[PDB]
Design a protein around this ligand. Structure first.
Ligand SMILES: N[C@H]1CC[C@@H](N2CCCCC[n+]3c(sc4c(Cl)ccc(O)c43)NS(=O)(=O)c3ccc(O)c(c3)C2=O)CC1
Ligand SMILES: Nc1nc2c(ncn2[C@@H]2O[C@H](COP(=O)(O)OP(=O)(O)O)[C@@H](O)[C@H]2O)c(=O)[nH]1
Ligand SMILES: [Mg+2]
Length: 169
């Protein structure tokens, strides 16, 4: 029987949560995917020789209090906190997603990876060192990815699974 990893992809609308998830599932870049769709995406994978199932929740903006967001935060075992390297505001929002997860879990240590998406884009606004420094302060990995060219997409999810395994082992 296969271990199922419940992963949640969080971050400001338009950073590429859906593109990243679809890239992992379908090996395809979507130019557009309806920004209001919050749904689960499953994939059977082998990570470091572990045959397992990834149950990935790709999330939507919710401006006010959301009982269902709280419940996914309670349920999720690992979180990809995604910003876009060309969007400073999405980077600044990261701290708010991390705080919310921690408050819901009532825990300062929760499996998480920081993801800087759209690494293919030549015009960056968020310095790598700045993002790396933040990750260091949180004690989590930092990966730069491109849903468009597939750069580090597997790496980002697989790293998160590694973070979940190590929390336990
Ligand atoms: N797009 C439509 C159909 C799905 C629906 N939806 C989101 C999918 C819920 C998937 C079950 N689930 C969860 S949590 C969760 C996690 Cl942490 C990881 C992987 C999961 O599959 C998962 N189900 S749940 O009851 O907490 C939940 C939370 C938020 C939601 O938007 C929904 C369900 C939901 O209604 C939203 C409307
Ligand atoms: N250039 C580039 N664009 C991307 C990347 N990921 C997403 N996008 C685009 O950014 C926009 C928002 O992506 P989407 O996946 O819907 O983000 P979500 O709201 O966070 O789900 C869409 O136009 C995507 O095509 C990437 O790695 N590189
Ligand atoms: Mg989306």
């Amino acid at each position: 029987s296969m271990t199922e990893y419940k992963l949640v992809v969080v971050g400001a609308g338009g950073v590429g949560k859906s593109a990243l998830t679809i890239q992992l599932i379908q090996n395809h870049f979507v130019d557009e995917y309806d920004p209001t769709i919050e749904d689960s995406y499953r994939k059977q994978v082998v990570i470091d020789g572990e045959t397992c199932l990834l149950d990935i929740l790709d999330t939507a903006g919710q401006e006010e209090y959301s009982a269902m967001r709280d419940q996914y935060m309670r349920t999720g075992e690992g979180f990809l906190c995604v910003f876009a390297i060309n969007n400073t505001k999405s980077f600044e929002d990261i701290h708010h997603y991390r705080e919310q997860i921690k408050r819901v879990k009532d825990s300062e240590d929760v499996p998480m990876v920081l993801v800087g998406n759209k690494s293919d884009l030549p015009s960056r606004t968020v310095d790598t060192k700045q993002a790396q420094d933040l990750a260091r302060s949180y004690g989590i990995p930092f990966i730069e990815t491109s849903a468009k060219t597939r750069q580090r997409v597997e790496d980002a999810f697989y790293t998160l699974v590694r973070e979940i395994r190590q929390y336990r082992l």
